[PDB]
């Protein structure tokens, strides 16, 4: 592997495992587009299994990119349109706090204060809708963005109503099998368990909990093989061969909403390139302005997301205009700006 990129990244890494004591860490470069690979450490520090190219990571909110591109891809294929009200696709949502609030809301956070998350209570269909049915709103829509796993995960349930499909079946046929991600699961099957890293949260062995809108908020495990293709994919989106998948990326990197230098995508969030680094809190309300229509995907970005569960801390950044990009997958969550600084010291050394 060329010794630049080889050391710029050993060089990064080990100072940062052994400063946030991680216990296993997986690192893809994609480097004008062709993926590298290292490894470091244990998947399971009891039974002493080493992290591979194969070993499945939790990916936390960096599920929310899957979610965003599968919401792109209905949208291609007509099924749902962004600017449908909410109560298009569940009718049933009548309390009048609803009136106005509409798909491209949920998927944005910016339906006027949805919480973080979806409470713990919640274990019906029926649980579901009295707690969005009781939920009243801070703001009104489309005025603050508010990070929130129940309104992209809502967004992601009813994307895929019109389909008829599960959510996992539709993001399994419609995303994951055309780019030939076939290490990627929203639920590992026995079969992948040798494969399952742990998560380690304050020295203890865990793994995500069930949650509701778990699958579409923060609940897929990949390899840093089927990463590095996730990232691969969306930094070249036109090399893909089935339409509304291609147009459905497209869309998820389009900037809907600005606060201060950050766009809000569908899960992706985006800068412009050349991206200050020191641009890039349980609860941060920002006020947000809407870009009016929204830009199409800007290839000079440095384009994003970090992702967290109680045991797993990942990230993947990319640049499309310089075919650059990296994924981060660690068993340990640890602070995110220090995987921010890892991988901007790693891209902006190569780019
Ligand atoms: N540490 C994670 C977060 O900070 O968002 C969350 N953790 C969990 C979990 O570990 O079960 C579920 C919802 S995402």
Same mark, same amino acid.
């Given at each position: 592997?060329?010794? @630049?990129?080889?050391?710029?990244?050993?060089?990064?890494?080990?100072?940062?495992?052994?400063?946030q004591k991680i216990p296993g860490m997986a690192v893809?470069?994609?480097?004008?587009?062709? #993926?590298?690979?290292?490894?470091?450490?244990?998947?399971?520090?009891? $039974?002493?299994?080493?992290?591979? @190219?194969? &070993?499945?990571?939790?990916?936390?909110?960096?599920?929310?990119?899957?979610?965003?591109?599968?919401?792109?891809?209905?949208?291609?294929?007509?099924?749902?349109k962004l600017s449908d009200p909410t109560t298009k696709?569940?009718?049933?949502?009548?309390?009048?706090?609803?009136?106005?609030?509409?798909?491209?809301?949920?998927?944005?956070?910016?339906?006027?204060?949805?919480?973080?998350?979806?409470?713990?209570?919640?274990?019906?269909?029926?649980?579901?809708? %009295?707690?969005?049915?009781?939920?009243?709103?801070?703001?009104?829509?489309?005025?603050? %963005?508010?990070?929130?796993?129940?309104?992209?995960?809502?967004?992601?349930?009813?994307?895929?109503?019109?389909?008829?499909?599960?959510?996992?079946?539709?993001?399994?046929?419609?995303?994951?099998?055309?780019?030939?991600?076939?290490? &990627?699961?929203?639920?590992? #099957?026995?079969?992948?368990?040798?494969?399952?890293?742990?998560?380690?949260?304050?020295? $203890?062995?865990?793994?995500?909990?069930?949650?509701?809108?778990?699958?579409?908020?923060?609940?897929?495990?990949?390899?840093?093989?089927?990463?590095? %293709?996730?990232?691969?994919?969306?930094?070249?989106?036109?090399?893909?061969?089935?339409?509304?998948? @291609?147009?459905?990326?497209?869309?998820?990197?389009?900037?809907?909403?600005? &606060?201060?230098?950050?766009?809000?995508?569908?899960?992706?969030?985006?800068?412009?390139?050349?991206?200050?680094?020191?641009?890039?809190?349980?609860?941060?309300? %920002?006020?947000?302005?809407?870009?009016?229509?929204?830009?199409?995907?800007?290839?000079?970005?440095?384009?994003? $997301?970090?992702?967290?569960?109680?045991?797993?801390?990942?990230?993947?950044?990319?640049?499309?205009?310089?075919?650059?990009?990296?994924?981060?997958?660690?068993? $340990?969550?640890? #602070?995110? #700006?220090?995987?921010?600084?890892?991988?901007?010291?790693?891209?902006?050394?190569?780019?």
């Amino acid at each position: 592997a060329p010794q @630049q990129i080889n050391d710029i990244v050993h060089r990064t890494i080990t100072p940062l495992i052994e400063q946030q004591k991680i216990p296993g860490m997986a690192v893809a470069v994609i480097y004008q587009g062709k #993926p590298y690979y290292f490894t470091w450490g244990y998947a399971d520090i009891a $039974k002493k299994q080493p992290v591979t @190219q194969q &070993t499945l990571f939790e990916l936390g909110s960096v599920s929310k990119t899957f979610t965003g591109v599968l919401g792109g891809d209905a949208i291609a294929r007509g099924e749902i349109k962004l600017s449908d009200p909410t109560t298009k696709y569940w009718p049933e949502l009548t309390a009048k706090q609803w009136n106005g609030i509409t798909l491209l809301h949920l998927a944005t956070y910016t339906a006027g204060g949805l919480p973080l998350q979806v409470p713990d209570e919640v274990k019906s269909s029926s649980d579901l809708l %009295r707690f969005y049915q009781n939920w009243q709103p801070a703001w009104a829509p489309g005025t603050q %963005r508010l990070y929130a796993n129940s309104s992209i995960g809502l967004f992601g349930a009813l994307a895929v109503k019109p389909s008829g499909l599960s959510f996992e079946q539709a993001m399994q046929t419609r995303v994951f099998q055309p780019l030939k991600l076939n290490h &990627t699961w929203i639920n590992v #099957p026995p079969a992948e368990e040798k494969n399952y890293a742990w998560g380690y949260r304050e020295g $203890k062995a865990v793994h995500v909990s069930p949650g509701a809108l778990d699958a579409e908020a923060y609940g897929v495990k990949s390899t840093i093989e089927d990463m590095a %293709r996730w990232v691969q994919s969306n930094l070249k989106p036109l090399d893909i061969n089935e339409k509304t998948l @291609q147009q459905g990326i497209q869309l998820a990197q389009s900037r809907y909403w600005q &606060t201060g230098d950050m766009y809000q995508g569908l899960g992706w969030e985006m800068l412009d390139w050349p991206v200050n680094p020191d641009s890039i809190i349980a609860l941060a309300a %920002r006020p947000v302005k809407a870009i009016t229509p929204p830009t199409p995907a800007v290839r000079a970005s440095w384009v994003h $997301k970090t992702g967290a569960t109680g045991g797993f801390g990942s990230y993947v950044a990319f640049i499309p205009e310089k075919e650059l990009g990296i994924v981060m997958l660690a068993n $340990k969550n640890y #602070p995110n #700006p220090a995987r921010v600084d890892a991988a901007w010291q790693i891209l902006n050394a190569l780019q």
